[PDB]
Every structure is written in structure tokens, then in C-alpha cells.
Design a protein around this ligand. Sequence first.
Ligand SMILES: CCCCCCCCCCCCCC(=O)O
Length: 148
Amino acid sequence: VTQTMKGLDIQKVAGTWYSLAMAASDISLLDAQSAPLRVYVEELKPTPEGDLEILFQKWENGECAQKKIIAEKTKIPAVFKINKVLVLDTDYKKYLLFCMESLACQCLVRTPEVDDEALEKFDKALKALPMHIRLSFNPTQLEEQCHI
Ligand SMILES: CCCCCCCCCCCCCC(=O)O
């Protein structure tokens, strides 16, 4: 992944996000509801120290579970450690593209709407990468727990 966000201001990614689209290098990372990188971002909470707390949902044991993880800052503002989280691109107010790296990337949006522009930038960021599965969700699914 050789696309990072230059001048990323991590405080400005705070708040609500929707996992509009997901993509992975291997089908088994996203194919099942219980697939390991099938994670639905809920909210980003950057810390004063510039770490990133992530609230998300994950289908485990036949149900939609509320989850919390801290991604720690690095010397690079656009790269965090959990496994690396890279921020590819964001305009803060509509969309944010990220990857975790075996590789999974998402298109996050601020609202439960299909943002064609953001999905274009997403597919273009992926053009390069060796993705073998891509999912996207409709507005109804975006307002349900675990996008059911
Ligand atoms: C721009 C920041 C968005 C990054 C969101 C990272 C998503 C968190 C990945 C969670 C790892 C899965 C853990 C698990 O449930 O086993």
C-alpha cells in the first residue's frame, strides 16, 4: 500500500462512519458474516496523545457484537499499529479510505448514502492492490447492526 494521506489531521476524522465498501486480498477474509476482516466501523475517537480508538461491530458466535480497539500512533501520521492501519485518503466531511495489512481496505462515509465519488476513489486506490473480494452495502443495510 503506497497511497497514504499527506497532512492527515487525525483529530478531524473523529465521529460517526459507515463501512460503505470493503475489499481484501483473500476471499476468506470477507466472504462470511463471521469472516475475520468483516468489521463494521461505528465511530473513530482520536486521543489527545494522537492514538485512535475504534468502535466497530463484528459477527461472532451467531450474533452482532460491540467491539473496541486502540490503534497506536507511529512516527507517520497516516499509519497506526494494532498489524498496520494506513489512512489512504479523506476529506474529513464525507469519506475516508483505509487499509489494514494479507490486506483489507474500506471506504468509510459519514452518512448512510451510496457515495459514487468515494467508491470511484476507493476502486482507483485498489486498482494497484491485489484484491480478490469486494463488498458494498445499500442504505438499508448501513442502518442495521452488522449490515444485516
Ligand atoms: C481510519 C481508521 C479506520 C481503521 C479501522 C480499523 C478497524 C479495526 C479492525 C479490528 C480488528 C479485528 C479484531 C477482531 O474482532 O478480532
